[PDB]
Amino acid sequence: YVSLADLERAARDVLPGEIFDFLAGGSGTEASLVANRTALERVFVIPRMLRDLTDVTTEIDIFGRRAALPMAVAPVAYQRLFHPEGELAVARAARDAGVPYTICTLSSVSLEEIAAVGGRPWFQLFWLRDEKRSLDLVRRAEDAGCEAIVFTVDVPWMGRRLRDMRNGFALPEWVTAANFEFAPATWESVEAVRAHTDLPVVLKGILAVEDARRAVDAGAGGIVVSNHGGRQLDGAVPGIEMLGEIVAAVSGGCEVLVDGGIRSGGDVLKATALGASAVLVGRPVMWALAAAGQDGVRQLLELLAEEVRDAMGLAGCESVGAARRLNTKLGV
Amino acid sequence: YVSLADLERAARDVLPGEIFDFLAGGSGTEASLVANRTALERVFVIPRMLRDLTDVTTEIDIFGRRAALPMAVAPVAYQRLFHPEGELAVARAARDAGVPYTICTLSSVSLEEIAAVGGRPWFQLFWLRDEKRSLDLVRRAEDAGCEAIVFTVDVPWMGRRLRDMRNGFALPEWVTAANFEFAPATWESVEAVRAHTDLPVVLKGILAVEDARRAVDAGAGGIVVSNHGGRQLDGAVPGIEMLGEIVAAVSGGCEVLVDGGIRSGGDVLKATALGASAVLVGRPVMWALAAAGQDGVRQLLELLAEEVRDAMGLAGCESVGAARRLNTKLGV
Amino acid sequence: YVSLADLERAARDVLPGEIFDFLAGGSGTEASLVANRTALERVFVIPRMLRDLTDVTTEIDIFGRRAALPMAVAPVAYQRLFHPEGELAVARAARDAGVPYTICTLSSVSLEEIAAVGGRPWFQLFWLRDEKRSLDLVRRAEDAGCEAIVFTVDVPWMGRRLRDMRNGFALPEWVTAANFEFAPATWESVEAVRAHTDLPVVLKGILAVEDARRAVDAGAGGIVVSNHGGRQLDGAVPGIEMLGEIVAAVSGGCEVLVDGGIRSGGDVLKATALGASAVLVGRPVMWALAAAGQDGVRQLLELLAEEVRDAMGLAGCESVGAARRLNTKLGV
Amino acid sequence: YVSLADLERAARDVLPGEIFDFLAGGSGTEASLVANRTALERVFVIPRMLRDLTDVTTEIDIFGRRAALPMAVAPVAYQRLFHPEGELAVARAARDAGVPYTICTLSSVSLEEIAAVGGRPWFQLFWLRDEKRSLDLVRRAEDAGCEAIVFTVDVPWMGRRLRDMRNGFALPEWVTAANFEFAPATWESVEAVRAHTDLPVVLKGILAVEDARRAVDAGAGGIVVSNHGGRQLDGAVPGIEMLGEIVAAVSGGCEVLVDGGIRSGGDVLKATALGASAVLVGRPVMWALAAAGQDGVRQLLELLAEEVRDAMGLAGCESVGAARRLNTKLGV
Ligand SMILES: Cc1cc2nc3c(=O)[nH]c(=O)nc-3n(C[C@H](O)[C@H](O)[C@H](O)COP(=O)(O)O)c2cc1C
């Protein structure tokens, strides 16, 4: 595989159409899904030349741990849909690559089993009608050694997934929510989580500048600037279009991650040049899992690491910090 | 039907080609028709997160009545072209949905019959060569319980409808103007109408900012920012491109509606975020009428209501007022 | 014929391919040719409503004569290529429509014969290696009753017409330059012409603002803002993109015409709203001549007059002056 | 051949697919490759009229020598891939046209043999792991009569060429690096070269404004504003998009060349109007070499010279200096 796009072709060959559509699809007309890609394609980097590249490093420190790349595996529900080893296959590959893996509230293997794989696991939280269940998940995650709580704030309820409605998609009987209904979360919910854990709380799905600022004021350790991969509000701005403004507004008060459409090391470099601390990658990780299980995810992460290192050095950056100081230009 | 676009396919299957073209078409090269869609597609919403959504309401108060959604059925001439029940089928579905229905001067069922259906009917006025006939229509509408007069100001004469000219389109003998020639209207005409009724006068087809201001000064209760669905001046700016500027200029002095190309609850949300009080929807209502009569219109209005509620809540808006405070970003 | 585009189809059916290509083609990659159209398509008009339209008039006064529309027939060489009656067919139709016709230096019927048709003829001048020949043409034109000299300033030599080179195009033996080598013209040439005639001198092919200003200072009575229909410099800006700036800079000091890609009454309205005094129309007139001779040109001019009147009134303009006061908005 | 695009078709017919792909391809998704073209296509020139064109000259003085056009042949590795005469065929045609030819460090004929052809040769330098080898190349180039050292600064290592990876491309046994591993170059390397030669040092692959300024401060005699034809960082801005800003920042302190996508005399004119001293042309020269050897390159250079002269005069420029004073407008 020489690009992330070779894996999409392979995943489409193997998965049942309705599962491929659950993975690929977005809400509504899929305008936000498409715009995630368009928005990245319009960003060009202004590389620097003739800098010292004797020891290029792609590592970052985030949430108190060193990561091998400025990237983590995004939360994706129900990974046994894609391969029988599901979350364990992905978590193992992420561990071996030194990349954080986000364990989902809707994981198809229990969070404690996935955490036992090792590595840098984070835990993604959905707020539930029964509040106590959400807070018990947080405590379970912490007890299992998760290192951050990624609170998803953009799903008061699931968006309108027309592919899924047209297909009549439902989980097969062999895939369940192994940790066991959505309730709208509020800033009060954020505070209840912050009070119940010593782990950094990361709010995922922030797009308004004033929500980024309020996240810092609320004691968040990070945010993920994100439109949920075009799966929630159809017509929501891409995160990459808000990122620069958000990074300026928080002025270092929390980590600022971005996601949506990251498909190469070059895209990682764009995100960092716009100011991101790190990116999340969702669909491509699942393409690799579908295509070739743990080995497939390993191969994807190896390719991404090579592309990140290549892009960084070609742009004159010996570190991710230097990459954040790059300028960009919008084009056609 | 899971989107408004499923109904277009169904209407195209059933209607005679020349009737489908009377409905779908615009003037000239159809540049303004296409631009209505392009203009909406370029607008992205910046949603807010973590707000209280315990009681999301899509209702608005407009022209002294509560409406279920920030939407009304646009005036569309000759609805018996599309289904034998014509305007009565649409008006009944609108009533049942709590949406205002605009009875047309060129209705194929008499305005008094349509008004007898009940609901929130408005009445659309064309100025006629015989002035007295226009003013008699106003009095008839008021006597029948219509709640606003929507004075169409963008049709001094009908535009050049090339599909209709190529098809040699004419009304079948079984479709007539049941209320019974266009004369250019002026500001004097507006004043003659205002003096002849106690109902709110709404000027439909305003696109220049200074015409919006003058509408307020003239005593209008509302305007509809509109290029008549691309059917009048070919090359007229889309209403959605003028809306923000217009809303700022009138600074709350009248209701500011918009139309043209509204095809989802997401589009309704864009219009409100740009400042609209409400939208009109034309062609999609007729697609539903063609496809399945009253039931079809009911299904469309149910789908739109679900999409509006979904979009609002995903954007952190418990009310339409909150949606008007959302920011937007233009994209690709 | 219900649009100018119906005539292109008809002309393409009848003309030999190499003649159609001589007519349609531009220089180089035809980037400027295509951009003439793109540039007009991006301009939207902001129409005004509720104005008096009791006596809409499309007339203008230009170069001391009343014209029926704000349009003239552009200079096009060798019109016997397109129809056996050539320039006489076009000139007769223009006369009957009350539109000025520009007689070309490279006319395939002598300028005196065309002028004898009557009407409002103008004369287009090429500067020649033998200066005296150019100045004799001017005197001949004036003696024959031409009312303006349109000095073409953008053809120091003919551009690179790749269609013509690929086709090996040459004039058939039955088409000649009936008035009988290009020399670069300079401001000195302009002055020599101005001194040799009492007619208004119009400089055709101006695109830089400072050249427009200098034209006024040089005593020009008009300019034509133009990239020669994309036939000269490939990559020259469209005239329509320079027009507003030019109109502001000359601040009424001469008439400012535009050409390139005008294909409807709506396009005429755009040009006027951008500030043009009038437009020239080239290729469409020749399509009509190819399709149906004098009658074809008459039909085209009738259609254009109807479209201009329609566009004007739909935009709230009772006169061309009012149309010049319209605002525009650039779109997608 | 009447355009540079006729030669691409001819080269694609004759070359083995993998060699055509080595030539045509870029890094990654080829976003930067495509953007080089897009960026030029959006630039329109504002031509001037009515200037003296009695003695139009396309000559420039650069690096102490007169060149026939504001263009040089870009460094392209391994030209025996394209034709058996390789670099000697191209160098001979360049000499005969009065265009500088850049001899490559990776030339498939030795630099001394190519320099013996005569003409204006420049020498392109790669910095090597063994520094002394790079500096020996510089001395060899100077001893052989090369007139400038073009130090390539954008290849700390070769980019990710996915066409080449998919094809399993490798040099055939009959093509070698005849002058005989990449090491990242730094500003220290630049200074080591500057100290080892009296020739002008030209830094090729500059895109950041501050790197342009530093190049001047470092004693460079020129820079080439360039993204290496889209072959290095995928997502690097096109040079043509940085050029104006760069030209302003150096304010005449060194020659500022540009490359990437130059495919006509019209494109040369755009580059000069944006401020370039001269352009480099890569792929088209190799298309001509593949198609017809020395004669093919001669024909290409003749066509380019004709197009440059044509564009200049149509734009009212009797000299390249005048062309640099032209204004431009971005379009669609
Ligand atoms: C199939 C699928 C399931 C997902 N499930 C979740 C989830 O349970 N929680 C969450 O916060 N995000 C979820 N996401 C969103 C991703 O975390 C991420 O925001 C999105 O996929 C990023 O875009 P990318 O897929 O373009 O890389 C899901 C995304 C996909 C494609």
Ligand SMILES: Cc1cc2nc3c(=O)[nH]c(=O)nc-3n(C[C@H](O)[C@H](O)[C@H](O)COP(=O)(O)O)c2cc1C
């Ligand atoms: C077939 C048809 C007939 C119409 N008749 C009228 C009319 O009689 N009066 C009027 O004010 N608008 C009329 N309109 C315009 C609509 O009220 C509305 O401005 C336009 O359809 C809105 O755009 P939409 O169809 O894209 O939703 C008509 C539109 C269509 C498509």
Ligand SMILES: Cc1cc2nc3c(=O)[nH]c(=O)nc-3n(C[C@H](O)[C@H](O)[C@H](O)COP(=O)(O)O)c2cc1C
């Ligand atoms: C076939 C052809 C021949 C032309 N000959 C002349 C000419 O002799 N003199 C001149 O000033 N313009 C000439 N023009 C340019 C036109 O006057 C005009 O600038 C151009 O056609 C306007 O664009 P349009 O064809 O898009 O309407 C010619 C154009 C065409 C298409």
Ligand SMILES: Cc1cc2nc3c(=O)[nH]c(=O)nc-3n(C[C@H](O)[C@H](O)[C@H](O)COP(=O)(O)O)c2cc1C
């Ligand atoms: C096949 C190929 C090989 C190249 N080899 C070199 C090289 O050895 N050194 C270098 O500085 N540039 C090299 N370049 C880049 C060119 O010098 C130039 O920057 C690029 O081709 C310019 O773009 P153009 O090909 O679009 O005209 C190469 C380009 C191509 C296409």
Ligand SMILES: O=C(O)[C@@H](O)C(F)(F)F
């Ligand atoms: O995007 C998803 O599918 C998840 O976030 C879910 F299942 F929660 F909506």
Ligand SMILES: O=C(O)[C@@H](O)C(F)(F)F
């Ligand atoms: O758009 C329409 O068809 C109506 O507004 C009419 F019939 F009046 F022009």
Ligand SMILES: O=C(O)[C@@H](O)C(F)(F)F
């Ligand atoms: O555009 C044209 O063909 C004319 O202007 C000519 F023939 F002069 F170049």
Ligand SMILES: O=C(O)[C@@H](O)C(F)(F)F
């Ligand atoms: O672009 C190229 O192929 C050259 O610059 C090389 F071979 F050095 F990378």
